[PDB]
Amino acid sequence: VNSFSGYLKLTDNVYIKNADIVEEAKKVKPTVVVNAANVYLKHGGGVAGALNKATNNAMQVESDDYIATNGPLKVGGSCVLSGHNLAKHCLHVVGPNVNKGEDIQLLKSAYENFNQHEVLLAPLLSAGIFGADPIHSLRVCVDTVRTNVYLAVFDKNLYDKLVSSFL
Ligand SMILES: OC[C@H](CC1CCC1)Nc1ncnc2[nH]ccc12
Numbered sequence: 593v594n595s596f597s598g599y600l601k602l603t604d605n606v607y608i609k610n611a612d613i614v615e616e617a618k619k620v621k622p623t624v625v626v627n628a629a630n631v632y633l634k635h636g637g638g639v640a641g642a643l644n645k646a647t648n649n650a651m652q653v654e655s656d657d658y659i660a661t662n663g664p665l666k667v668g669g670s671c672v673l674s675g676h677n678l679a680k681h682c683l684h685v686v687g688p689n690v691n692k693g694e695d696i697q698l699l700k701s702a703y704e705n706f707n708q709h710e711v712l713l714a715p716l717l718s719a720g721i722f723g724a725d726p727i728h729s730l731r732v733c734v735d736t737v738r739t740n741v742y743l744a745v746f747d748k749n750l751y752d753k754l755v756s757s758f759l
């Protein structure tokens with residue numbers, strides 16, 4: 593039993609809800625919130641900009657130190673950093689950004705990072721401003737993640753479309 597509420601169950605382990613991930617994380621304070629990161633951990637827009645804003649820029653400060661020490665992530669890769677006031681940990685995961693010409697096949701590799709954590713709150717990787725088809729992202733999620741994932745989707749028409757089209 594966990595404290596996630598109001599989710600539709602899609603499979604044994606994948607759940608979905610129309611929600612603002614910032615407001616969800618503040619309520620649940622999950623062990624792991626997933627950020628839709630880029631390789632530079634520059635949290636400007638989309639989910640990343642919203643999560644960072646909610647931390648009063650502390651996420652960006654921590655991220656800049658991480659990059660200065662370690663260099664950029666790989667597309668498809670991840671790192672674990674603090675969750676600040678939102679969660680215990682933030683798993684920064686880099687899905688391919690189609691608006692940059694990155695290979696969509698890397699989306700499966702990106703979702704594989706979720707399997708290192710028993711329970712996660714997360715957005716659909718490569719959706720929104722990353723320019724991929726969200727129906728595809730949900731399909732890859734369901735077919736790749738084996739741990740318990742609670743997907744937040746900050747758009748009603750999209751959410752309704754994702755539910756009604758889910759196979
Ligand atoms: O990338 C996945 C979705 C895509 C957008 C919804 C339609 C375009 N983004 C988000 N999902 C959940 N919570 C969020 N908070 C701020 C942004 C955000």
Ligand SMILES: [Cl-]
Nearest residue numbers: 638639720721
């Ligand atoms: Cl987005």
